[PDB]
Design a protein around this ligand. Sequence first.
Ligand SMILES: *[C@@H]1O[C@H](CO)[C@@H](O[C@@H]2O[C@H](CO)[C@@H](O)[C@H](O)[C@H]2NC(C)=O)[C@H](O)[C@H]1NC(C)=O
Ligand SMILES: *[C@@H]1O[C@H](CO)[C@@H](O)[C@H](O)[C@H]1NC(C)=O
Ligand SMILES: *[C@@H]1O[C@H](CO)[C@@H](O)[C@H](O)[C@H]1NC(C)=O
Ligand SMILES: *[C@@H]1O[C@H](CO)[C@@H](O)[C@H](O)[C@H]1NC(C)=O
Ligand SMILES: *[C@@H]1O[C@H](CO)[C@@H](O)[C@H](O)[C@H]1NC(C)=O
Ligand SMILES: *[C@@H]1O[C@H](CO)[C@@H](O)[C@H](O)[C@H]1NC(C)=O
Ligand SMILES: *[C@@H]1O[C@H](CO)[C@@H](O)[C@H](O)[C@H]1NC(C)=O
Ligand SMILES: *[C@@H]1O[C@H](CO)[C@@H](O)[C@H](O)[C@H]1NC(C)=O
Ligand SMILES: *[C@@H]1O[C@H](CO)[C@@H](O)[C@H](O)[C@H]1NC(C)=O
Lengths: 49, 1008
Amino acid sequence: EFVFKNIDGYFKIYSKHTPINLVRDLPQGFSALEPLVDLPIGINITRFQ
Amino acid sequence: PPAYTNSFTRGVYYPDKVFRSSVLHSTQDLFLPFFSNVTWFHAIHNPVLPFNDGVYFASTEKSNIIRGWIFGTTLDSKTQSLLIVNNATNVVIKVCEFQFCNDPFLDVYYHGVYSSANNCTFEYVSFKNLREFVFKNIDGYFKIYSKHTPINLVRDLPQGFSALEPLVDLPIGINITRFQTLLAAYYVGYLQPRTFLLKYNENGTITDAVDCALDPLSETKCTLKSFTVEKGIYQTSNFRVQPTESIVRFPNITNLCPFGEVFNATRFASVYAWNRKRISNCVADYSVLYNSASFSTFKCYGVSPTKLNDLCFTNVYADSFVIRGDEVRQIAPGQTGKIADYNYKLPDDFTGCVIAWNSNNLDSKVGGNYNYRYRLFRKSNLKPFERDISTEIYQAGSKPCNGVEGFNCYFPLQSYGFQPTNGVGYQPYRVVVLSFELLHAPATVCGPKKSTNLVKNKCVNFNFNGLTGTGVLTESNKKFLPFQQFGRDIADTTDAVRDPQTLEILDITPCSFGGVSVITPGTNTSNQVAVLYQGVNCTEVNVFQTRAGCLIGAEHVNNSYECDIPIGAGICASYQTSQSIIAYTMSLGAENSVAYSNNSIAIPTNFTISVTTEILPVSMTKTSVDCTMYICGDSTECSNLLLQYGSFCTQLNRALTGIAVEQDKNTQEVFAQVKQIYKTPPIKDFGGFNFSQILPDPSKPSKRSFIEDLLFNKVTLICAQKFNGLTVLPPLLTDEMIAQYTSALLAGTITSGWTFGAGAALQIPFAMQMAYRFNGIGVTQNVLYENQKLIANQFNSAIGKIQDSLSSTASALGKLQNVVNQNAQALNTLVKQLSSNFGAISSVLNDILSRLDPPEAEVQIDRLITGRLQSLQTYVTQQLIRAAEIRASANLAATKMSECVLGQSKRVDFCGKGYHLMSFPQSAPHGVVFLHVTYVPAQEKNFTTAPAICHDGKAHFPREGVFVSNGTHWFVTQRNFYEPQIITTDNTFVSGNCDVVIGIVNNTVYDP
Ligand SMILES: *[C@@H]1O[C@H](CO)[C@@H](O[C@@H]2O[C@H](CO)[C@@H](O)[C@H](O)[C@H]2NC(C)=O)[C@H](O)[C@H]1NC(C)=O
Ligand SMILES: *[C@@H]1O[C@H](CO)[C@@H](O)[C@H](O)[C@H]1NC(C)=O
Ligand SMILES: *[C@@H]1O[C@H](CO)[C@@H](O)[C@H](O)[C@H]1NC(C)=O
Ligand SMILES: *[C@@H]1O[C@H](CO)[C@@H](O)[C@H](O)[C@H]1NC(C)=O
Ligand SMILES: *[C@@H]1O[C@H](CO)[C@@H](O)[C@H](O)[C@H]1NC(C)=O
Ligand SMILES: *[C@@H]1O[C@H](CO)[C@@H](O)[C@H](O)[C@H]1NC(C)=O
Ligand SMILES: *[C@@H]1O[C@H](CO)[C@@H](O)[C@H](O)[C@H]1NC(C)=O
Ligand SMILES: *[C@@H]1O[C@H](CO)[C@@H](O)[C@H](O)[C@H]1NC(C)=O
Ligand SMILES: *[C@@H]1O[C@H](CO)[C@@H](O)[C@H](O)[C@H]1NC(C)=O
């Protein structure tokens, strides 16, 4: 997953890899996401595509 | 080689001319510290001594040789000099200036000098004896204090005290930092910002003064504002453990810091093709900038190079190119020209540094370089952040050009010639430019910031990646996730921090905190101290470490005794065992082990009848502090500004009057619960129960008996409160009427007893009243009817002990005394907040208005009056809570009088320790005193017991009082007094068979 946001001019991206074997839908469970890359770009971005 | 002696209690002077009587008013100013070294001087074979904060001078001049002084700061024939002459009993002072010689001195071989002057500004003329002259300059005024005391001793200073009254005021106004006397034993001292606790007598003479920070007892006295410090432990002040130096930590080195890689580039690009190497996400050591010996220029525009390392940049840049030598000075803001426009334009707000160095011996060729080209001319300045790689053909005229030179067709491309015959301005140079940007983004690049070293187990500051603070770092075993940097606690307080350099988990702990207690016995017994440093390990600060803290001055005692001065966590101190202060583990009473038995009892055969004394604060100082007068002193502006608060002013008085009326109510249901004021019979035939001590004495002016008089004398500051609007309203019940109600209640207790609480009083002899007040506690009346005289003996003995308790003990009336106190310093601090600035310029409204214009004075009194209103709100809330406590005690006293004076209370430990008998109210101001006559067994005897008796196979249990035996025969007696009965059917009832009863023994029952 790629979390996109400019909060207080600080662009954060989190990740969490879980090896599971199912394709039906999103898992019914709990997960925690820890940051990997943090570039405080601070750009006035309000839309994405 | 000056000798140093002890100054004793010398160096105390009247700080100001205000007169004070019988008050221990403490003060702090430039003073001579107690027990300080004194530099004794003599005239053998005359230097300049520092003035310091103050100067103390003393001398012993029987023949009056020491009479002169020369003071000053430079003495360069330009500054005025103090000059004191005492000739013909005349004091002469003048500040003229005269030239000095190599060794200026006064003709004094064995038994004056003055030349002309330059500038004179101030003119003024006025063993057996010890003359003292302190010298100081406060607010530009030079002050001299004198005291001549006739003594007969010359070897050293006397061991006593004497004040130093002043003589003259000298308003020189000139700063003085040096002095020098002119000439047989005289001393010199020095004044320091100390603090004393002065003591004025009845006539206003300072009889004794004590320093504050001399010893722990001195600090205790300074805090308490008293000389006689009783027993106990007193919290004086706090203590801090200062950080050692500092700890600053930041990431460093990282991978390579590859600035030298840019420096040692073999080839360089053209001037038009300057290359930007982005610098980010790397710790900048900035070590390359230090070696400036090889750099031709080192300057910065728009940034301070000194603060480059101390500040962090979000992003940084470095640019390198090669140009000619003479173009260095043209790289500056505010400069124009072809080079400044068509090549590189410097904005006026450029932030960076320009660095260049010689490269002619490495970047020059014999035949000339042909690699760096650019565009010579262009129509306008280059737009920002544009790469000028365009090679457009210059065409000044209107004639079109076909790419070949001709008519008005000039080729814009020209080549440079690098030759040895060229001048200095043709040399090739290396140029490197650094630009640092701070956009609207957080900083990403930080300097090393002197990572230094890291110290464990020693309190010190710390700065970890911008996390500052103070504490002590300790090794910890708390694991951290790789993305988690620093720890936390429940209260959002930092607990663990990991070192950025090494992934080691370090705790953070308070430095020391804790106050500074002072465990001292009363001056009645001893004079030694024992400082307890609350809850600190005995490592940063004879010494016996305790759970409660680090204890100093007392040795641990392996034996355990009764606690006398509680310390903390079970530790207790005492001076008795020469004898010295100790600190041991408290043992609550002698460790007893009552022999719990299968069938044995210890029923008392004798007893005692004490008369304890529990004092209950029933009423208090009825106060109704009017808001307007107290809060604002006689000011229309203050009245208008106070009216804004509105309901606070009008409701503070409502709350205080509610307090007053409820205190009168407390008094009403406490004393005035008797309908008719009964009076003592003229003849007191009580069967030996002497009552004259507590019954009112007709010979006395008021009907307050001896005990009440002693109480009133013991409790004590009378007309010093009702002075600032704190109108102490008189009680509705006059103190004489309070005495009347107490006497009525006590006389009803005598003649009517408990009955006068349920209607009119019903007469009963005092011998009959105790004849059933014993019966209340399960004690048969035969006790009194057989030992009434002895009962009277114990009663009168306890009454006699009451006077001793009042006189010899200052804590006998502790509760009432501290209640009257609490009120006294409550009103006192209420007064002092009139002096507190509360953030205003001063505490005088008139001074504020006179000093400044009303536009700002109004704001000043606004802040001051908000502070005063907050202070009054705090006082009234504290008064409400204290009056709630007083109301709880008043209902408790009413309950004790209803159940205990107007009855015989069955609640244990309510009317004293033991089986209660009766009580006597003895009013004391803002309170009441009870005389809890109780019953306490003393002497026991071990007997044998059994619940039941089977004579004819039928069990027999005692109605009241367990079965006992003296060894041969079995008897019945109540619990609280051994009195045997012959076991008969009258005192026993049959219930069940024998084999169902546990502990039953066979026995013989008499048959009436
Ligand atoms: C209980 O103790 C008291 C003392 O507190 C005893 O009173 C003593 O009585 C004898 C006569 O029997 C006198 O000679 C003594 O002078 C009394 N003592 C004092 C201090 O005056 C009392 O007798 C004891 N009662 C019993 C039953 O032992
Ligand atoms: C104060 O002066 C009076 C003089 O009438 C004297 O009687 C009294 O003893 C003095 N007070 C003290 C404490 O010496
Ligand atoms: C306090 O001082 C008085 C004065 O002599 C003395 O009688 C008394 O014993 C002292 N207090 C104690 C507890 O020793
Ligand atoms: C005081 O510090 C030492 C280490 O210097 C430690 O062993 C001891 O347990 C500490 N004292 C207390 C009461 O924790
Ligand atoms: C009661 O005590 C007072 C003083 O304590 C004494 O003057 C009086 O004579 C005593 N009365 C009796 C009856 O003992
Ligand atoms: C009873 O007390 C006496 C005197 O102290 C003692 O000698 C005896 O052993 C005790 N008996 C019991 C059963 O405790
Ligand atoms: C117990 O009291 C009785 C009373 O008559 C007496 O005869 C007997 O000797 C007493 N025994 C002891 C051990 O006191
Ligand atoms: C306690 O006394 C009873 C008396 O009947 C006896 O039966 C029992 O054995 C005794 N127990 C002990 C532990 O002495
Ligand atoms: C008590 O006396 C009865 C006689 O009726 C006897 O049966 C019983 O055993 C006795 N018990 C004890 C403990 O002596």
